[PDB]
Amino acid sequence: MGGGDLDASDYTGVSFWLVTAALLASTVFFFVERDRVSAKWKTSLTVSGLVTGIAFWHYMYMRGVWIETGDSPTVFRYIDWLLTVPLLICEFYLILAAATNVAGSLFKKLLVGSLVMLVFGYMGEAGIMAAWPAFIIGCLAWVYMIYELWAGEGKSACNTASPAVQSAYNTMMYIIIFGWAIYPVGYFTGYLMGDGGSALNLNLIYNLADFVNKILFGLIIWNVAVKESSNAPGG
């Protein structure tokens, strides 16, 4: 709960264990809860869960291996991310907008997403410089993302849409912003300062961001979909 000072095997182990435990817990819960989800969301959870599940597992493995030695094939994480971004988004918006027809959000996410990956890939290729400025490029892209998103055609479909769709959308944007905004928040804590520049904090923070950007994604989407659809309190 705060600090930032652990040996290699120390931090590596703590995170590794936390990831394994969390991953499993989220897997068993999300799996068993697969039957405790809204009916109309049957396909929503199928496409969203399939893409989110494959990306999470893949990315997770890649990340772990990357920090394991220090060098790994980014081509996998790049293509996976670029293949999961438009997939998870398009699908999610597909079934979500399916209530009326289709969601144009795919276009917005396509442009923004492409740009983000472009910078991360181009700069990441050398990793010489981009962590510091990452706050700028990211901030701008983030603001613009929600800026136009806030006016999405979602509610434009009919007028005020349904309470379920509005709940899932609002919660989705909220998490996306928080998480995406947290990435740079923690990274900076280990980018310039930390303890001389330990790769540990880098891997951990990275895995944490991708973990919540994948796990939490389905956790919230499902929680809001199940809570809105028809469910009672109890945790």
Binding-site ranges for ligand RET (CB under 6 A): 55, 59, 81, 116, 119-120, 134, 137-138, 180, 183-184, 210, 213-214
Shortest distance, CB of residue 84 to ligand RET, whole angstroms? 6
What gap in Å lies between CA 45 and CA 41, rounded to an integer? Answer: 6
- Closest residue to ligand RET, Cβ-based? 138
The structure tokens listed for 36 are 């405790």
Shortest distance, CB of residue 184 to ligand RET, whole angstroms? 5
**For ligand RET, which is the closer residue by CB, 37 or 116?**
116
Q: Are 171 and 220 in contact (CB under 8 A)?
A: yes
- The sign of the torsion formed by the CA atoms of 65, 70, 73, 75 equals positive
Q: Are 38 and 229 in contact (CB under 8 A)?
A: yes
**For ligand RET, which is the closer residue by CB, 44 or 214?**
214
Instruction: Write the DSSP string, 129-144.
Output: S-TTTHHHHHHHHHHH
The DSSP symbol for 98 reads T
Shortest distance, CB of residue 26 to ligand RET, whole angstroms? 14
Q: Are 25 and 80 in contact (CB under 8 A)?
A: no
Shortest distance, CB of residue 173 to ligand RET, whole angstroms? 13
Shortest distance, CB of residue 99 to ligand RET, whole angstroms? 24
**For ligand RET, which is the closer residue by CB, 11 or 217?**
217
What gap in Å lies between CA 9 and CA 22, rounded to an integer? Answer: 19
**For ligand RET, which is the closer residue by CB, 164 or 176?**
176
**For ligand RET, which is the closer residue by CB, 50 or 158?**
50
Shortest distance, CB of residue 108 to ligand RET, whole angstroms? 15
Write the burial class of residue 6 (CB in 10 Å: 0-12 exposed, 13-18 middle, 19+ buried).
middle
**For ligand RET, which is the closer residue by CB, 38 or 93?**
93
